[PDB]
C-alpha cells in the first residue's frame, strides 16, 4: 500500500498472505483385452509375441496418445486464434503476445501444428518467397518444410486436429500414470512398456467359454493447469480459418434407387469438413441425405443436396449446393 | 453382501466426484466447438 | 512482502510515466508502423531535446504490431535476411532506439 | 519514502517525452451471437480490438 508523508492518521492497512490449491486426480483405466479359444490359441497362433502381444501394447499406445489428445484439445480455451491462409505469421505472433501478456515462462514452449496447419505454414507466401523471408535455400518451396516462427518450434502431429495448432507451457498440461498391481489371485502376469509407460499384463483362462483372457492395462490421469481466478493462459490454441466449402466430385448420379453415395465436403484450405457439416435436401421426396453426409434417392428425378459448414470463424454458414440424378 | 454380487459403488470415488477436480473437457469432435465445462472453470480453492 | 513492495514501486513509476501530461498522442498505424516512430523522434528533435539519454519503453500489443509488420516480418523490405521479426517475433531497433518491452503500461501504448 | 516529478518546461509545456499509441479501427465481443443457459446466468463480456488489445 502508499500513504502520504506526514499524514495526521498514522493507519496502515494489514496485507494479507493467502495460499491456494488445486487437485490432481488419477480418473481413467486404459485396456486392451483380447480372448482366444483353445483352437485358435493351439492352431492359429503361430506367434504369440508378434501376433498378439506386439499389437496390444501398440494399441494401447495410440490409446495413450489419444488420451493425451484429448487433454491437449479438450483444455479450457476462451478463445482460439484464427489463421489467416494468406497471412500465417500474425496468429502466430498473436500467440506468443497472448502468452506473454500473461506472464507465462518463454523457455519450455510447445508448438504442435496439425497437418492442414503446417501445409497452410509452407504455402503461405510469406516463407514460401524467399524475399519476404530471406531464406535463398528456400525450404518451403523445395521440401514444404517451414520448422520455425514466431520464436516457437513447429512440431507436426497427425494425432490431433488438421486444422488446430496449440502452444503450450510445459506447465500447462500434466499427465499421471500408474501401473496396477498382479493380485495374488492372478496368475504371474508380464510387464510390458508403451511410450515409456509401464503396463499390467494378465492372463485368466476361462473353463466356461474354453478360452483364454488376456487384460494389458494402465492407470491414468490428466490436469490442466489453470489459473488462481479459474482462466486458462498457459496455453492457447490456434485454428485455420475457412472461407468456403466444396462438395468433391461435383455433379453426381446414384446407379439405382437403392443406392446409397457418401459424400465428402473440403473447405478452400483443403481440410475434409465432413463430420462439421449439415447436410439438406432440396427434394426429399426424390433423395434423402443423411446428417453423415451420406445421400439416398428413394424416388427417380433430381434433387439438391445443400452442405452448410458454419466456419471456425463463426457467422454465417458456407453453402456448397450439389445436384443429384436418382434413376 | 456376496462376493458374488454386483460391485458396489466406491467411497473413493463419490469424494473424488465430490472433491470436483476429476477434469472435464471438450468432446474435440463436437462441432460448433462446446463451451467450456464450469469445472473447467473453477477457480483455485483458497484454503485446501 | 518486498516483491509487495517492488511491484508498487514500479507500478508508482508506471503512473508517473503513463500520466503525464502529454500533449500529444502520436497514433501507431499497425499497417505500417515505422512512420510513427520517425514522427516521435522528429517531434522530440523539434524540441531539442538531446539525442542521447533517450529510452523507448513500449507495451505488449505495441511490441506484437511492430513484429506484424511487413516492414520488419519481410526481408526485402527490411535488409535482414536472417528475419528476427519473423523466425523470431523480435524487434530490437527502429528509428534509432532500441525497444524495450514492459508488461507495467498500457498494452497499446 | 517517495516523490516523483515531471520535468515540464519553463513555459509549462511538456516536451521531453513523447506518448505513442496504437490505433483501433475495428472492437469485436469474443464469442459473436450466444444464448443464455438461463435468466440467473449471467456472461462477463470481453471485447477486443482489431490489434488484439483488451479495450
Known amino acids: 500500500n502508499r500513504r502520504d508523508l506526514r499524514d495526521p492518521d498514522r493507519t496502515v492497512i494489514a496485507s494479507e498472505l493467502v495460499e491456494h490449491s488445486f487437485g490432481v486426480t488419477l480418473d481413467k483405466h486404459v485396456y486392451a483385452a483380447l480372448?482366444?479359444?483353445?483352437?485358435?490359441?493351439?492352431?492359429?497362433?503361430?506367434?504369440?509375441?508378434?501376433?498378439?502381444?506386439?499389437?496390444?501394447?501398440?494399441?494401447?499406445?495410440?490409446?495413450?496418445?489419444?488420451?493425451?489428445?484429448?487433454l491437449i484439445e479438450g483444455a479450457p480455451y476462451e478463445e482460439t486464434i484464427l489463421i489467416d491462409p494468406a497471412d500465417t505469421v500474425p496468429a502466430f505472433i498473436t500467440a506468443d503476445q497472448r502468452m506473454g501478456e500473461a506472464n507465462v515462462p518463454t523457455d519450455s514452449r510447445r508448438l504442435v501444428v496439425g497437418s492442414a496447419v503446417a501445409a497452410a505454414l509452407a504455402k503461405d507466401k510469406q516463407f514460401r518467397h524467399a524475399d519476404w523471408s530471406g531464406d535463398q535455400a528456400n525450404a518451403a518451396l523445395r521440401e514444404a518444410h517451414v520448422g520455425r516462427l514466431a520464436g516457437m518450434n513447429v512440431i507436426r502431429?497427425?494425432?490431433?486436429?488438421?486444422?488446430?495448432?496449440?502452444?503450450?507451457?510445459?506447465?500447462?498440461?500434466?499427465?499421471?500414470?500408474?501401473?496396477?498391481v498382479v493380485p495374488e489371485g492372478a496368475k504371474a502376469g508380464a510387464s510390458f512398456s508403451a511410450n515409456g509407460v509401464a503396463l499390467r499384463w494378465l492372463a485368466d483362462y476361462d473353463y466356461s467359454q474354453l478360452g483364454d483372457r488376456t487384460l494389458l492395462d494402465v492407470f491414468t490421469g490428466r490436469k490442466v493447469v489453470t489459473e488462481?481466478?479459474?482462466?486458462?493462459?498457459?496455453?492457447?490454441?490456434?485454428?485455420?480459418?475457412?472461407?468456403?466449402?466444396?462438395?468433391?466430385?461435383?455433379?453426381?448420379?446414384?446407379?439405382?434407387?437403392?443406392?446409397?453415395?457418401?459424400?465428402?465436403?473440403?473447405?478452400?484450405?483443403?481440410?475434409?469438413?465432413?463430420?462439421?457439416?449439415?447436410?439438406?435436401?432440396?427434394?426429399?421426396?426424390?433423395?434423402?441425405?443423411?446428417?453423415?453426409?451420406?445421400?439416398?434417392?428413394?424416388?427417380?428425378?433430381?434433387?439438391?443436396?445443400?452442405?452448410?459448414?458454419?466456419?471456425?470463424?463463426?457467422?454465417?454458414?458456407?453453402?456448397?449446393?450439389?445436384?443429384?440424378?436418382?434413376? | 453382501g456376496l462376493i458374488s454380487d454386483p460391485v458396489e459403488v466406491d467411497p473413493i470415488?463419490?469424494?473424488?466426484?465430490?472433491?470436483?477436480?476429476?477434469?472435464?473437457?471438450?468432446?474435440?469432435?463436437?462441432?460448433?466447438?462446446?463451451?467450456?465445462?464450469?469445472?473447467?472453470?473453477?477457480?483455485?480453492?483458497?484454503?485446501?
Open chain 1, 228 to 327: 488462481v481466478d479459474g482462466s486458462f493462459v498457459r496455453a492457447v490454441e490456434l485454428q485455420l480459418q475457412a472461407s468456403s466449402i466444396t462438395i468433391v466430385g461435383g455433379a453426381f448420379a446414384l446407379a439405382t434407387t437403392t443406392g446409397t453415395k457418401q459424400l465428402k465436403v473440403r473447405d478452400d484450405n483443403g481440410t475434409d469438413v465432413t463430420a462439421r457439416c449439415t447436410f439438406a435436401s432440396s427434394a426429399g421426396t426424390k433423395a434423402t441425405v443423411s446428417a453423415a453426409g451420406l445421400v439416398t434417392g428413394v424416388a427417380a428425378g433430381t434433387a439438391d443436396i445443400t452442405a452448410s459448414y458454419v466456419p471456425p470463424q463463426g457467422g454465417t454458414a458456407k453453402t456448397a449446393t450439389v445436384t443429384v440424378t436418382v434413376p
Open chain 2, 13 to 48: 470415488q463419490v469424494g473424488r466426484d465430490e472433491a470436483g477436480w476429476v477434469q472435464e473437457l471438450r468432446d474435440r469432435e463436437a462441432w460448433p466447438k462446446q463451451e467450456v465445462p464450469e469445472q473447467a472453470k473453477k477457480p483455485a480453492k483458497v484454503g485446501n
Open chain 1, 157 to 180: 502431429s497427425n494425432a490431433i486436429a488438421p486444422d488446430k495448432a496449440y502452444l503450450w507451457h510445459r506447465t500447462a498440461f500434466i499427465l499421471a500414470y500408474r501401473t496396477p
Open chain 1, 35 to 70: 480372448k482366444f479359444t483353445d483352437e485358435q490359441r493351439t492352431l492359429d497362433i503361430r506367434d504369440y509375441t508378434k501376433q498378439v502381444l506386439m499389437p496390444q501394447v501398440s494399441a494401447v499406445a495410440y490409446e495413450l496418445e489419444d488420451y493425451i489428445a484429448e
